[PDB]
Design an enzyme around this catalytic site. Sequence first.
Site, PDB file in Angstrom:
ATOM      1  CG  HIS A 177      -1.894   1.098   1.272  1.00 50.81           C
ATOM      2  ND1 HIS A 177      -2.864   1.316   0.304  1.00 50.81           N
ATOM      3  CD2 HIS A 177      -2.019   2.073   2.184  1.00 50.81           C
ATOM      4  CE1 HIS A 177      -3.564   2.397   0.663  1.00 50.81           C
ATOM      5  NE2 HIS A 177      -3.064   2.874   1.792  1.00 50.81           N
ATOM      6  CG  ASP A 207      -5.937   3.064   3.936  1.00 54.37           C
ATOM      7  OD1 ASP A 207      -6.331   2.544   4.991  1.00 54.37           O
ATOM      8  OD2 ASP A 207      -5.090   3.992   3.974  1.00 54.37           O
ATOM      9  CG  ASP A 243       0.474   1.368   5.289  1.00 56.37           C
ATOM     10  OD1 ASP A 243      -0.432   0.648   4.823  1.00 56.37           O
ATOM     11  OD2 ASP A 243       0.276   2.368   6.008  1.00 56.37           O
ATOM     12  CG  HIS A 276      -6.705   6.884   0.949  1.00 57.54           C
ATOM     13  ND1 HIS A 276      -6.249   6.210  -0.157  1.00 57.54           N
ATOM     14  CD2 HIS A 276      -5.911   6.526   1.977  1.00 57.54           C
ATOM     15  CE1 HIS A 276      -5.200   5.468   0.191  1.00 57.54           C
ATOM     16  NE2 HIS A 276      -4.972   5.628   1.486  1.00 57.54           N
TER      17      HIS A 276
HETATM   18  O1  LIG Z   1      -1.559  -0.780   7.805  1.00 51.70           O
HETATM   19  C1  LIG Z   1      -0.719   0.084   8.550  1.00 51.70           C
HETATM   20  C2  LIG Z   1      -1.575   1.320   8.786  1.00 51.70           C
HETATM   21  N1  LIG Z   1      -1.974   2.158   7.632  1.00 51.70           N
HETATM   22  C3  LIG Z   1      -2.817   3.348   7.731  1.00 51.70           C
HETATM   23  C4  LIG Z   1      -3.357   3.841   6.399  1.00 51.70           C
HETATM   24  N2  LIG Z   1      -4.460   4.803   6.591  1.00 51.70           N
HETATM   25  C5  LIG Z   1      -4.039   6.198   6.658  1.00 51.70           C
HETATM   26  C6  LIG Z   1      -3.059   6.122   5.488  1.00 51.70           C
HETATM   27  O2  LIG Z   1      -3.611   6.316   4.203  1.00 51.70           O
HETATM   28  C7  LIG Z   1      -2.365   4.786   5.723  1.00 51.70           C
HETATM   29  O3  LIG Z   1      -2.205   4.144   4.473  1.00 51.70           O
HETATM   30  C8  LIG Z   1      -0.783   2.286   9.690  1.00 51.70           C
HETATM   31  C9  LIG Z   1       0.481   2.739   9.292  1.00 51.70           C
HETATM   32  C10 LIG Z   1       1.174   3.595  10.155  1.00 51.70           C
HETATM   33  C11 LIG Z   1       0.720   4.045  11.374  1.00 51.70           C
HETATM   34  C12 LIG Z   1      -0.529   3.591  11.765  1.00 51.70           C
HETATM   35  C13 LIG Z   1      -1.265   2.730  10.933  1.00 51.70           C
HETATM   36 ZN   LIG Z   2      -3.557   4.696   2.747  1.00 53.22          ZN
END
Ligand SMILES: OC[C@H](NC[C@H]1NC[C@H](O)[C@@H]1O)c1ccccc1
Ligand SMILES: [Zn+2]
Length: 1014
Positions: free
Chosen positions: A60, A174, A311, A441
């Site tokens: 991601h 996401d 991610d 997003h």
């Molecule tokens: O899967 C890991 C997660 N991703 C969060 C997603 N949502 C907000 C952004 O677009 C990010 O891709 C995360 C990444 C880092 C800190 C906290 C959570």
């Molecule tokens: Zn994201």
Amino acid sequence: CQDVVQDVPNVDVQMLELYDRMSFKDIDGGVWKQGWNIKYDPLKYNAHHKLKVFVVPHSHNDPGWIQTFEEYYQHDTKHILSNALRHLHDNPEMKFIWAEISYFARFYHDLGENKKLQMKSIVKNGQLEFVTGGWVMPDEANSHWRNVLLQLTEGQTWLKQFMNVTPTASWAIDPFGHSPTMPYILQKSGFKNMLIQRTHYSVKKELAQQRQLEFLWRQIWDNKGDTALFTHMMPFYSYDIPHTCGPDPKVCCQFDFKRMGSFGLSCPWKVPPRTISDQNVAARSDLLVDQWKKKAELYRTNVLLIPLGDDFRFKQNTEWDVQRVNYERLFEHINSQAHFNVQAQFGTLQEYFDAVHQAERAGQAEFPTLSGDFFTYADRSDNYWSGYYTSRPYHKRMDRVLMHYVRAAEMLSAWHSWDGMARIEERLEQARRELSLFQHHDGITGTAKTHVVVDYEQRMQEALKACQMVMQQSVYRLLTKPSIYSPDFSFSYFTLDDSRWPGSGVEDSRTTIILGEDILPSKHVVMHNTLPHWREQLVDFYVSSPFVSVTDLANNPVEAQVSPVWSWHHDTLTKTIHPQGSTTKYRIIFKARVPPMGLATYVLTISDSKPEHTSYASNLLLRKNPTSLPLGQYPEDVKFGDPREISLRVGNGPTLAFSEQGLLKSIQLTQDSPHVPVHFKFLKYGVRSHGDRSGAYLFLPNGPASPVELGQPVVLVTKGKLESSVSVGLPSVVHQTIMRGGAPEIRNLVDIGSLDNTEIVMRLETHIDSGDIFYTDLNGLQFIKRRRLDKLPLQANYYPIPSGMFIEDANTRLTLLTGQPLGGSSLASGELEIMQDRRLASDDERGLGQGVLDNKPVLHIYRLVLEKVNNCVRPSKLHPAGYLTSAAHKASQSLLDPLDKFIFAENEWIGAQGQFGGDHPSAREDLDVSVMRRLTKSSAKTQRVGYVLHRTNLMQCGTPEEHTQKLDVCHLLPNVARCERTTLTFLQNLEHLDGMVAPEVCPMETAAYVSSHS
Ligand SMILES: OC[C@H](NC[C@H]1NC[C@H](O)[C@@H]1O)c1ccccc1
Ligand SMILES: [Zn+2]
Ligand SMILES: *[C@@H]1O[C@H](CO)[C@@H](O)[C@H](O)[C@H]1NC(C)=O
């Protein structure tokens, strides 16, 4: 055409009905915290019925979030892609899916030819597969459908050109909640399948219990089902590896091989992954296959999707190896042990869907139908993600301004073929790509770090300058005698004048037209109308003298009104917010009449004294202890008075009454009718001092809002023949109500200043007996019925307001249209409310790592339409949709696609013409040419122009409104040789049209056509 009003569709799952029945209890379901302990019959799978498992590696990649797009590209994404190329090339059975084309195009253009060819090869053989193929994975709450289509088209046009592929499966893991606008656009763009993830944990549990996680998602008004798109909703809390192998994250985390230590990662459940070996593969396989069989119980076929990613994963070579080798050992063991009755392998998203549909065709499953949306999302407890419906509102408003500028630049320049030296395609591609990037997003959602928001703003500012350049060069070409036209493609023949962006009080950026006997007697101005019907609309310009008159290019006088230029200042000396008038510039206002998709020229001329066809507004300042307000040459002296209630009426339109604090109190539609209570009020929400804190994503109020204490604000009343207004300087908001003869326009200059942990809301209180029902739109495309649920917390009753909302009873409707997406609700019968800005000191634990403390003044715009609707043919009580009236739809168009204004820059325009497009058809009011885009460069022998046509559905209320011309876009340009219906991205021809005629579309339908010219 299908009737989108009178036929209630019969679907297996209708989300509003589901919400009414659901209990939403948040109980501990065990290792699957928000589910239950899944059980399965081990005998379900055997030699003749095996479970087919597709493990789909993914990464991601956010195009800006904690780092800017370019920072992530340099630190992470370029390595992920370069290593994916190497590893996939070297391991033929390994697979990988990719979603964000903005990054892929940034990477591919930096590759040498040898690598470009290797990349094309792993795409052609199916190892690397693009999913969705948009420039970004867009937000689905605040985005306008026109920009969702723009970014999808930008990514897929790039993919067709360079990779020769067009994805038919979408991946949206996401966005924070999901909109049916996505399957609507995707199904009309060739897609056959889509995947979603962030839906309320209570909805996942409910649909999982009924094996309704895969469904045919149709639009809420679609009785027949032709809009249906097969949709897969993932079942668990996250798309990360711990929440994708099965219900127990303590077990799944042990199969994320990047978590053993050297990578700086670990498993929060405290059991680490272990390298697979011959002495543990049987035990590890038994744990893993058990999670897979539990997940498979939630679905109807014997084909199981197991995403494998997170991610910015798959960066280092050691990470590619650790995941690939360990999974290869598990697959060799599992696939060779008959007792598991499993065949597992790396796969792509399309491979999964193709196998699910083969199972369906074999009669092994039938899928339920579903309509509705998936807002408002909560990932756990009462943590509802309605804060991002408002976060960073300056940029949410900028998105809508750029949306319109991109449409107008592409349409104005499409009329001609341009030499490459004009850099028209170059500037339009830049503008389309910066606006497309912002649909991400974490872009329009207002959920990125402060320096990332600055990057998006800078990119959009460059895109607005690109649009202006293209627009003004187009206007000069369209309105100059051909044998005189002599363009300098770097020159500014016109400057754009925009009255609402950035806005009065936000940036002093408008140019004053400077006239004077000793410098310049007159100035030409040109208006453009991007809509396909004639439009009259008041327009205004700043001028250096109040003695100015207007004429059309046949020299016919045009009635005009001059008013002062008022600016509001927070006086630190007196501690009051009050207006100051200019003594050197004035506003001239007049009605411009512009052809469908055309241009009209006017002339402003100075005179020594009051001209015959120009009137002057009166001005009344209401406050105790007033001081003088000189206005230079303005001819009417400002009047003063103590605060008092006042009433105004422009033309034959409504009469509006205002409180002594300058806020609307009532609207009387006609001379006879009652003064209907419609009260504006500003209130504030706070943040909890214990528990979870609101942040950029979450809205966690510390109870119902409290009224803003207004003090005794200064009120300014300007009364004119063409335009009147009431403006008041309230704490954090200069609120204005403008009347031009029809529905009023509201403008709020919102400056939350240093008010920490505060959300400012604008509420409308009425005595409309709406109960618990209200309507909000989805992506500016459709209105969906909402029901306020007291069983859910306040923040769960907040919904995106991307372009409008309304409440109604049997007889009366109040509709509030917006010029920017914001969050809102109806928290009690008769009320509407919309959030203006929010300033939050705390991070909300979703990864952003900061509060929202970078607020800046923003000018929000609205139209307020009070109407009688007892004579309208409305959907039945069980229909999940609602529809605008003609007046509310036109009011929305006034906000989103206003006339564009151009001021000729030089002193004399030789060869000027008065009009363009007088012969263009003036189409029915419900039809729009959403996109006009030339698709070929000048060297193409056969030119091609693409059109996207959208027809909305307006309520029948007994207002004939007739005599309109058929619009055939294929004959808008001469010498047409072919007309084709295409997918909405223009990438596939669907129908060769007889007579080269593009038929108009049905209500709520959108179609695309490409005309070819010899
Ligand atoms: O899967 C890991 C997660 N991703 C969060 C997603 N949502 C907000 C952004 O677009 C990010 O891709 C995360 C990444 C880092 C800190 C906290 C959570
Ligand atoms: Zn994201
Ligand atoms: C693009 O894909 C099509 C698949 O139908 C193929 O026939 C065509 O040759 C491809 N074009 C190339 C070689 O890029």
